[PDB]
Design an enzyme around this catalytic site. Structure first.
Site, PDB file in Angstrom:
ATOM      1  CD  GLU A 296      -2.674  -1.437  -0.075  1.00 20.66           C
ATOM      2  OE1 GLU A 296      -2.951  -0.457  -0.785  1.00 20.66           O
ATOM      3  OE2 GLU A 296      -3.029  -2.598  -0.378  1.00 20.66           O
ATOM      4  CE1 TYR A 383      -4.188  -7.423  -7.770  1.00 17.50           C
ATOM      5  CE2 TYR A 383      -2.591  -6.522  -6.200  1.00 17.50           C
ATOM      6  CZ  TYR A 383      -3.899  -6.614  -6.676  1.00 17.50           C
ATOM      7  OH  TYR A 383      -4.910  -5.890  -6.072  1.00 17.50           O
TER       8      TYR A 383
HETATM    9 ZN   LIG Z   1      -2.147  -2.997  -5.158  1.00 17.50          ZN
END
Ligand SMILES: [Zn+2]
Ligand SMILES: [Yb+3]
Length: 610
Positions: A296, A383
């Site tokens: 994050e 991802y």
């Molecule tokens: Zn992310």
């Protein structure tokens, strides 16, 4: 060169652009509604502009005011997950670059897919209700009228009226609080976000929140019973921010606070500016799940500063973030650890491709989301296939130091902008102009637009992974007369991360004989581990191996927390096991009304209910 956001029904950035949002709303827990006005400052990008369209989803519009007078508007028919287009007729045609402010009076639906309203019983305190939002990808329109596309960035200010005893927080800098002039039993919390952001980063939480400082620019927020544990769990936050700044450039958001949400938060974390939202399932007790904070934190650059122009390009946001994430972990714990996490990531990519199928469209790095709900297509592919590509380019172009130089230049180049995969590729070619011959060797069409595993797997140091693979293979090749050989000492030299990788390795070859699973519990006592990642994989291993004793445990974890990553696969494994199928369906049915709306929807689809 025209690319449109197929997930938005609002006027595109080429027609008009929202520059600022001033939100004034009140949180009504009795009615589970957010009520107020959204004043959008909009700039025309065209000559003679006389109308514009905004995205809405289950919003109740009372009126639209421009220049102090009400104007005509019309809500079109709903287009499933995209919501309903709101066309507004401007009172006076606008010239190019002209700016006006449009104030919309609206009310949200209790069923808003962006919000989850929790009764006091669903909180830690048991005395107060709680509300939290999650707008990514396209749920901001279910909170307020807006051009719900990441291709538009705006600043915002907000005033939020909430019951006196509660606290409101947003993805912005806190700008004070005061009693509510028109209701003494309420408080108005003010907020300011001076850095332009795509609307999916707008966030709001309202609840009995307390804070504790854990770094020079970081406060941890949660209900009181989670403050001490969270402060310790995320104590590495400031050192990670410092490494991230060294990697991506200065942190421009001012504060970097953390908010630990109730168990039903759907993600491990959400990169809301100034206030990262995180799942309480990270509270393992030993800071072992801190890579999620590193992740994050990285988004403060890759995603929040440089943003994907449309959701088809989501991998830009995630691949680069995972890449920066793993570098933060590499600096903190060693290059061999970065390689271990990287190889694990490839393992998760294998899992995703096997789950969707190697020819499935959602396994493509760049996906076409026209007519596809982003929540349904969401997976580990952008991802991990995204990270895999960057890792492969890193090794191709000369190493981590060289590629990190490209990443810092990339961020600098596209800060405060929204870009596409083509923009990224053009810059990669520009930056590595002296290595185009090398770049011209990568199979771009396959990496970017083909489904399945990447055409090439990067090179990974295997040092930390070896012991995990060796123990996993011993169990898989073990026959009944070998089970006595296993003992708790097998785990002696394994970190929690390796224990997790050992289970991930074994889970890839599941099911295992039921007797092997019983032996594993007997000698390793995995039932005792509360680390959520390890418990998650261990339970899936038990369920897929048909161990009935694991049913109540799997059901408990699937429902006591709601991180999609864990809840969806558990419900799916429980549904696939005949002994638990009926109960999984029944447990879903019973918890459905009190689950997060998106998670409820996805588990509903996974289980094929309704
Ligand atoms: Zn992310
Ligand atoms: Yb044998």
């Amino acid at each position: 060169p025209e690319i449109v956001d197929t997930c938005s029904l609002a006027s595109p950035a080429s027609v008009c652009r929202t520059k600022h949002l001033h939100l004034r709303c009140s949180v009504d827990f009795t009615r589970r509604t957010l009520t107020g006005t959204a004043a959008l400052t909009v700039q025309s990008q065209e000559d003679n502009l006389r109308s514009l369209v905004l995205d809405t989803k289950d919003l109740t519009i009372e009126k639209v005011v421009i220049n102090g007078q009400e104007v005509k508007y019309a809500l079109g028919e709903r287009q499933s997950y995209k919501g309903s287009p709101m066309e507004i007729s401007l009172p006076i045609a606008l010239s190019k670059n002209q700016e006006i402010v449009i104030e919309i009076s609206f009310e949200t639906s209790p069923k808003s897919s962006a919000l989850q309203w929790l009764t006091p019983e669903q909180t830690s305190g048991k005395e107060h209700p709680y509300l939290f939002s999650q707008c990514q990808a396209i749920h901001c329109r279910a909170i307020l009228p807006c051009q719900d596309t990441p291709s538009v960035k705006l600043t915002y200010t907000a005033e939020v009226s909430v019951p006196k005893e509660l606290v409101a927080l947003m993805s912005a800098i806190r700008d004070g609080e005061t009693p509510d002039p028109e209701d003494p039993s309420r408080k108005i919390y003010k907020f300011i976000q001076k850095v332009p952001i795509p609307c999916y980063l707008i966030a709001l939480v309202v609840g009995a929140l307390e804070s504790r400082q854990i770094g020079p620019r970081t406060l941890v927020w949660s209900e009181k019973e989670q403050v001490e544990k969270s402060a310790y769990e995320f104590s590495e936050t400031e050192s990670m921010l410092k490494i991230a700044e060294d990697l991506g450039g200065p942190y421009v958001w001012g504060q970097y606070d953390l908010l630990v949400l109730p168990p039903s938060f759907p993600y491990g974390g959400m990169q809301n500016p100034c206030l990262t939202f995180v799942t309480p399932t990270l509270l393992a007790g030993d800071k072992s799940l801190s890579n999620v904070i590193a992740h994050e934190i990285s988004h403060s650059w890759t995603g929040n500063l440089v943003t994907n122009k449309t959701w088809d390009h989501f991998w830009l946001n995630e691949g680069h973030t995972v890449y920066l994430e793993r570098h933060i972990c590499g600096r903190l714990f060693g290059e061999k650890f970065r390689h271990f996490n990287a190889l694990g990531g490839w393992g998760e990519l294998q899992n995703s491709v096997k789950t969707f199928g190697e020819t499935h469209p959602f396994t493509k790095l760049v996906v076409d989301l026209t007519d596809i709900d982003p929540d349904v297509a969401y997976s580990s592919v952008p991802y991990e296939k995204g990270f895999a590509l960057l890792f492969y380019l890193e090794q191709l172009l000369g190493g981590p130091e060289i590629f990190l130089g490209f990443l810092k230049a990339y961020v600098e180049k596209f800060s405060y902008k929204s870009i596409t995969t083509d923009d990224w590729k053009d810059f990669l070619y520009s930056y590595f102009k002296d290595k185009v011959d090398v770049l011209n060797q990568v199979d771009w069409n396959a990496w970017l637009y083909s489904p399945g595993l990447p055409p090439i797997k990067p090179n990974y140091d295997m040092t930390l992974t070896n012991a995990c693979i060796a123990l996993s293979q011993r169990w898989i090749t073990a026959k009944e007369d070998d089970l006595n050989s296993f003992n708790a000492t097998d785990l002696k030299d394994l970190s929690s991360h390796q224990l997790n990788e050992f289970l991930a390795q074994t889970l890839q070859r599941a099911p295992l004989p039921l007797g092997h699973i019983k032996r594993m519990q007997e000698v390793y006592n995995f039932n005792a581990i509360n680390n959520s990642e390890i418990r998650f994989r261990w339970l899936r291993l038990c369920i897929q191996s048909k161990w009935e004793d694991a049913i109540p445990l799997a059901l408990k974890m699937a429902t006591e927390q709601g991180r999609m990553k864990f809840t969806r696969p558990l419900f799916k494994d429980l549904a696939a096991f005949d002994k638990s199928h009926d109960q999984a369906v029944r447990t879903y049915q019973e918890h459905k009304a009190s689950m997060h709306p998106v998670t409820a929807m996805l588990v509903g689809k996974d289980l094929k209910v309704d």
